[PDB]
Write a protein that binds this ligand. Structure first.
Ligand SMILES: [Cl-]
Length: 246
């Protein structure tokens, strides 16, 4: 290199900075402002300093997955207006701050799977008008996050392996571009008449309901009534009650 630009412990080509799997405990200093792709995944990063990405206005892809993050500072991504892919999966995130994605108006893919999220700010997805993939398996969600119902460009939505018991009426009706919907691994409450929306939705969308074995597997029987092998799509009206709702 007839000129510097690559942090210690990373490898760089073009506008890519690759610090993946480098045994890092923190974000390296001196990442160039011209960087478009930043790999910080598969490290031991436990916190991100407020402002650490403020300079990186040209970032299109940011991989922070497979670290040890438990929270994000407010405003962390506010500079990243060009960002189209953000991966935060396989961390220990217990909350998201208000407005954390508010400036990411060009975002297309958001990975939040394998964290400890139990609830989310109500407007957390509201500015993500172009979003195509929202992957949130393997958290602690007990209700469908408000806002997903308005993400009309979604092709991929993963909600599997949470603690969801039902889907609010009509919640998926605007999501007419879905090709992959992951719903398995939730304790769907088939006692409650509220399940009939999900029952009918799966019945009407059997080709897009998926499970995951390393790749997508079409299986509309994979959304099951809690504790049983009974598919939610097979639930009868007669078997539900307008008052076993939790
Ligand atoms: Cl996921």
């Amino acid at each position: 290199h007839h000129h510097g630009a690559c942090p210690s412990q990373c490898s760089c080509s073009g506008t890519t900075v690759n610090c993946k799997s480098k045994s890092l405990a923190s974000v390296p200093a001196g990442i160039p402002t011209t960087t478009r792709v930043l790999y910080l995944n598969d490290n031991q990063i436990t916190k991100l300093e407020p402002g650490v990405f403020d300079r990186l206005v040209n970032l299109q892809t940011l991989w922070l997955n497979n670290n040890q993050l438990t929270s994000l500072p407010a405003g962390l991504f506010d500079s990243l207006t060009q960002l189209t892919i953000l991966a935060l999966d396989s961390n220990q995130l217990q909350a998201l701050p208000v407005g954390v994605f508010g400036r990411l108006v060009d975002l297309q893919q958001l990975y939040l799977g394998s964290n400890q999220l139990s609830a989310l700010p109500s407007a957390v997805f509201d500015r993500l008008v172009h979003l195509k993939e929202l992957l949130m398996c393997c958290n602690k969600l007990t209700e469908l996050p408000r806002g997903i119902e308005r993400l009309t460009h979604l092709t991929h939505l993963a909600l599997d392996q949470n603690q969801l018991k039902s889907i609010p009426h009509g919640a998926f009706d605007r999501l007419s571009s879905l090709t992959h919907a992951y719903l398995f691994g939730n304790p769907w409450d088939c006692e409650c008449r509220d399940i009939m929306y999900l029952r009918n939705w799966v019945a009407d969308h059997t080709s897009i309901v998926m499970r995951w074995d390393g790749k997508a597997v079409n299986d509309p029987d994979s959304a099951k009534c809690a504790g049983t092998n009974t598919p939610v799509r097979a639930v009868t009206e007669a078997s539900t009650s307008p008052s076993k709702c939790p």
